């Protein structure tokens, strides 16, 4: 007269996220070296009175 | 005379959207030295009257 019969359910204990990016680290240095010439000429005239 | 037959249909709650973007910040730092060592020479002539 009675049934034969299965009742389950579940239940939650913890939930655990994450996350998604992307970082980065970058270094750098520079060495530089740079020399330079010159040749000027001029020319002056002048009247005083 | 009668049929055995199911008739069934869908309805909507809700309706959620989400978009794709790639966002992205950078801070940075900058740290330098220049030198320079330096030689002149001129020459100089002139007639007056």
Do not use: C, F, W
Not at 2 to 21: D, F, Q, R
Not at 24 to 46: L, M, P, W
């Amino acid at each position: 007269l009675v049934a034969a019969y299965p009742i389950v359910g579940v239940g939650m204990e913890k939930l655990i996220i994450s996350t998604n990016e992307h970082a980065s680290t970058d270094q750098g240095k520079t060495v530089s070296r740079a020399t330079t010439n010159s040749k000027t000429e001029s020319n002056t005239a002048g009247v005083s009175v």
